Design a protein around this nucleic acid. Sequence first.
RNA 1: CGGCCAACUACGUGCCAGCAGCCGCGGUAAUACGUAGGGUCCGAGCGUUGUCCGGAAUUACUGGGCGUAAAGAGCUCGUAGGUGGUUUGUCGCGUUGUUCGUGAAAACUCACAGCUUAACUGUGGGCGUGCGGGCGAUACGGGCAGACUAGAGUACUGCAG
RNA 2: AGUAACUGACGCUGAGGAGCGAAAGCGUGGGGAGCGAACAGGAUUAGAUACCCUGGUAGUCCACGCCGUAAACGGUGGGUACUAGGUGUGGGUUUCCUUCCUUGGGAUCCGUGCCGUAGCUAACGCAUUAAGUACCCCGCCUGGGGAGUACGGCCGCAAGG
Lengths: 228, 88, 32, 131, 180
Amino acid sequence: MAVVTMKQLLDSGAHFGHQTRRWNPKMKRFIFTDRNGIYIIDLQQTLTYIDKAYEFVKETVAHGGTVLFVGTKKQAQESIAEEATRVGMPYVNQRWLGGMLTNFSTVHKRLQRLKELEAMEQTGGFEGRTKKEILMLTREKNKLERSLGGIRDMQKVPSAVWVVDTNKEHIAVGEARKLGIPVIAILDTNCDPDVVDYPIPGNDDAIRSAALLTKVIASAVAEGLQAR
Amino acid sequence: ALTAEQKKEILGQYGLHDTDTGSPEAQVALLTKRIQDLTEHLKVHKHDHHSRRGLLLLVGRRRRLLKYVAQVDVARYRSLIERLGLRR
Amino acid sequence: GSVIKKRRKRMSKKKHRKLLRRTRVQRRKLGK
Amino acid sequence: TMTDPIADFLTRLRNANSAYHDEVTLPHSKLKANIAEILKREGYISDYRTEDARVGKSLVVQLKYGPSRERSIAGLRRVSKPGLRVYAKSTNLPRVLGGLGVAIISTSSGLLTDRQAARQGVGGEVLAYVW
Amino acid sequence: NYIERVVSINRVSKVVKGGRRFSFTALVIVGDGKGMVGVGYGKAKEVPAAIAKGVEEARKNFFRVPLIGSTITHPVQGEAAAGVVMLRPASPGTGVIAGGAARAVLECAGVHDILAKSLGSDNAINVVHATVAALKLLQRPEEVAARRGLPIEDVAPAGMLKARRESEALAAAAAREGSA
RNA sequence: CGGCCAACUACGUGCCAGCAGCCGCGGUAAUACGUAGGGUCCGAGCGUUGUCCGGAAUUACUGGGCGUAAAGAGCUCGUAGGUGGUUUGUCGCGUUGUUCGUGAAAACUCACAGCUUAACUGUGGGCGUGCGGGCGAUACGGGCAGACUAGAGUACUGCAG
RNA sequence: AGUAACUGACGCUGAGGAGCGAAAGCGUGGGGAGCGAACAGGAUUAGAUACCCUGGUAGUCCACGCCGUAAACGGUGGGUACUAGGUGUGGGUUUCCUUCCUUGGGAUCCGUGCCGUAGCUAACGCAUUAAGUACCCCGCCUGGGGAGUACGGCCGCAAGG
């Protein structure tokens, strides 16, 4: 089932991503030909895993499976900002501070300090002391709201299926795997497809392929949000 | 080394037909000619230790080939030794 | 490896050659 | 040089199995053809084929992997090497993995496995273990 | 309802500018007595704190130990940093014939009549890993038939099925004689 | 009667007297030295010596290793030896099945019997892991007589040092 | 390296054995500019049989012999088959555009480097030029000192091996 028309996939282009110096595959079906020094992603194998991933999320979210929001690369942050705001979800743009899902016995109290300082600020405690402390109070408040944003509503031992920046946050995906709910990602052509159960072939640098893919899943999880 | 015509003269006169180049007759006849030329060189260049090793790698091969002929046939082994003048 | 083992064996070697040098003429006498 | 084509037949399979290769091309021989038949019947490989090449024939062995990408062979071992021949009498036969793994034994009745020799009372030279 | 076996207490001490910085380590094994064991390494500044931290790490490292009756399936030999252990099944009524660190893992899993040996390093930490690796190299009767694509009886031997089949009947009747 | 290792305190001296299989206990307050009081293991027995096997996968066939821990000859040529690509025909030496003769008793097994029980004794199987004959078998190794070109060696044409 | 014309398993390893083997050193005869063990002074120092300085002989060089040892090190024996790649560099062959030169790219054979999976290792690290996965043959190891020492023997003019 293709939401976007087949001909317009040809006009969009699916032959980008890397050169012949940083290819690390292990599957001989994801190699079509070698021209221009750039490997050819096969559309057929892309749509098969796209539909399989589309069904798996459809079954997961209808029963009540959750996936949260993350993104750090410079051509994906602003895309999810609009999508997250429209759907109301927050987002994390700069820092997946390593060791956040395993260390919920430390980052939970940080959510307490923010709500303790926020409730301190709603009260109106401003000028009982110097303003250097309050200057850094808002600095760390913005730092926490910049680095940990989507953690506000969960209280539910999270399920994680979304992976962002597979290659450069290679240990951020491990910290998810120690308690490893199955995971998906837009495949970096230098990233091993077998480790992630749903390696979706996309483009690791293009905003068009980055935004369209997370928009497709965002719509797919939205229909299951409506049909609860 | 041996010129192309020098080899072509030895090859035809010792070979078993007008085409052979790797018969044990052809190789022993060729190696013996190379050896006799080389040891003539070492009679005036006594210190050519690196070229004497090349001489030793050839005599070892010729004995290796001569051992094959004696195994496969005794009559053809004697006929080669006498025609060339060797002893074993 | 470590060099301590080498200078442990080196001293026994160095000492022994000294002994042969000192007893060089006496050895050639009792060797008759 | 080469001294045991039965050994390199197994070490090609072991290297290719670990690297998750899907086909293994080997030079073909009557002894190696028969061994591949046993591995197929006992269910360790999928299929094999004898094709032709520039100077001789060629065996290709289509390896089998599980539905969750797990191996079908736990290992292979060569027992009776050149220079130490290991012959098994019909009443003291080897037993691989206790009783799970299987062995290949070359006897007068043809290449038989571990269980076949017990049911037929014959013995012979051991060849290899596959488990 | 897990039996806990502490196998080693070592006092390790980093040396610092003012002297040393002693601390304690523990290697407790937690086992349920039916074929699930886990190892755990807890480091703390006090022994009761160290034994505890080793325990919470152990309970999260459980893994099934494939048993036939009350003894493992086939001989095996695993390896660790340098430890070697030689787990091998035995007939009923034999007891756990194992050494120092291998006994703790084996008596926590619930294997009862097994033969062992320690053919490498004699460390408490390494031998614990070596026997764990050897236990992870274990197969099952119905699992091997699944791999090789055959019915069970053509793969496993007759005696192995009898022992497995008998264990079902003995366990079943005693279960229904205590529950019904 | 420290850990191994089943079994702990008081008293007398303190680098002495001494103990001690190893780590190690005795520098006027010791579970480790003598003394008593308790405790454990055995028991007509208990300890120490001398010897062997074991643990020692610590000569490793079963069952180890050589970069730096002990361990690759300074490097090549080659004798004896060890080892052998694809395939057809044949022998049956190695290999293997069965059969006969042996493998003498006691011994160690199993079963049974008799000494009031045991030790001990007797009867019948097993063993005696091997050897010499007959009858097959021909998958592998091998002996013999062949056949191929993928290994190895020549040939022709170039090329660098 | 290219063509496959030629014989048709003629291969691999190789106990003892034989040859080659940096430097220093030995013999007979030449040669000797510089550098220079030994040897003299000068200086530093508590002392200088040293570092520093000024001089200086065997030697370093050539012809013919001998010696046969080195961190003679990749501290990694030889042969063979397989097991992701990326980027350099040295030789020889050839398809895709042609300017019709070549760092144009493409493929393949043989060397020589750096990085990096599977795997292996106690770790350091090795990783298609394995320390990975297997087969054949050789050498060697079995706690440290005593000791590569003594005694016996072989070789050597001697040093000594």
